[PDB]
Design goal:
homodimer; 262 residues; alpha/beta; Rossmann fold; 8-stranded mixed sheet; 37% helix; globular
């Protein structure tokens, strides 16, 4: 019989941060990927990836491969920041449900309505640490969210547009709480009238997702496409043949091209 | 802030040296959280493991939870990689993936660089079949009738070669942008051999072939022409699917076509 030297996978140009939120003492596990390529003079673009445990490596590996030949692929070297949890799985059910939801569900269920506190954590706590530890281009920040994550990202677009210059919004759970998030869609044009930078919004959905999801995303897409404003660039992609769990890897490269600066 | 290292649950890394050459390999292994079915886990062997292992791992981990909805079976992932920090080795993969030796009389490009070592495919297959797989099958419950080979690029050239010459080694082939043009299309000299193999085949064999629509013209045409020929083979042991990824390129076809590929090679 034969042996093998057994080891753990350690990914190069990555690191992890353990952090607790100031207000609630909530524990986060942050995954960070830095490009092999030198920063441009203005700093690296940065991509904040919600549900970091589920999607971090996928973003990391695609950027690491595609950004080598940027003029062929249209993908810029970017720092990836997975915003995750100290868990063994892909998703943290209770924690994300709270973090991603702007209001307490209408009339026990898991706590909802923690999006304000989560946004505070990101803006006031996580971002200053990333910006001090890495050379960041602060005019080239992207927020990615899928699912309830996409709900949160849509919420930020409607209420805190200037926080990110690109939004990669995947199968957003807009149905959530009787479409309460859509009640703030009104705000967008008001926000755009004062936006600092042209804002890119890439919306995606799988064609085989449940009818209410597919229809909601197509309707939202038609409303966003109707906007004609210098500060908004919008793109929609319905992934044909793809379902709720497979739209993210399928749409990833189109998203990366849309948010990139080549 | 407390600085840490990312350590992924239900994964491990093995260091191996091939018996014959002492070639060092880095093997990455992902095991599903879900228990093995009675006959064992399906298994996916991923060439250029350093480049693609985590992508396969993450997609299976997410999609296989709701298999009746996603069509993705829980599978063990084996990244067949190298002791490197990058996505791709240079000379090591070129040697491993290529079945023939480029003529020593091959002219050099203006750059004056000697041709890389070629013709190691036979030895690589020996390493996989006789060394790596028994080791995986000893340490994990494997369904040996539910094995996939994935290769992209020069890796897809290798995977095509095995399909043509050693079909029974895997029951599914995920062949991404295969470098068919390599050495004056030498790999296609074995294409007719596929009927012989199909007529000996134990299991129905799945073949998923993909290319990005914005790849070099000769690659796009090569893959399309191969697809048309494979669609002409009308055999009970061959199940073939082709996918041209509209608007994708050589580097981006993999993630884009990944889920289509996983649904095709799965058992739900």
């Amino acid at each position: 019989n034969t042996t093998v030297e057994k080891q753990q996978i350690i990914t190069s140009n990555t690191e992890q941060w353990k952090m607790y939120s100031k207000l609630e003492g909530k524990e986060y596990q942050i995954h960070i990927s830095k490009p092999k390529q030198p920063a441009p003079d203005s700093g690296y673009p940065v991509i904040y990836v919600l549900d970091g445990n589920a999607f971090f490596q996928t973003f990391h590996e695609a950027v690491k491969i595609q950004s080598v030949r940027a003029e062929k692929t249209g993908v810029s070297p970017a720092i990836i920041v997975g915003v995750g949890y100290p868990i063994e799985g892909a998703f943290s059910g209770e924690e994300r449900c709270y973090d991603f939801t702007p209001s307490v569900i209408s009339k026990p269920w898991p706590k909802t309505g923690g999006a304000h506190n989560f946004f505070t954590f990101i803006e006031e706590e996580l971002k200053p640490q990333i910006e001090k530890n890495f050379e960041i281009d602060k005019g080239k920040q992207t927020l990615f969210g899928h699912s309830l994550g996409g709900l949160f990202a849509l919420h930020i677009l409607f209420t805190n547009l200037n926080a990110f210059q690109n939004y990669f919004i995947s199968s957003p759970s807009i149905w959530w709480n009787n479409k309460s998030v859509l009640e703030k869609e009104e705000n967008l044009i008001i926000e755009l009238n004062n936006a600092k930078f042209e804002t890119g919004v890439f919306l995606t959905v799988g064609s085989l997702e449940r009818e209410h999801m597919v229809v909601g995303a197509n309707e939202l897409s038609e409303r966003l496409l109707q906007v004609n404003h210098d500060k908004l660039k919008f793109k929609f992609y319905e992934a044909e043949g793809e379902n709720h769990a497979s739209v993210v890897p399928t749409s990833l490269s189109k998203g990366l091209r849309f948010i990139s600066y080549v």
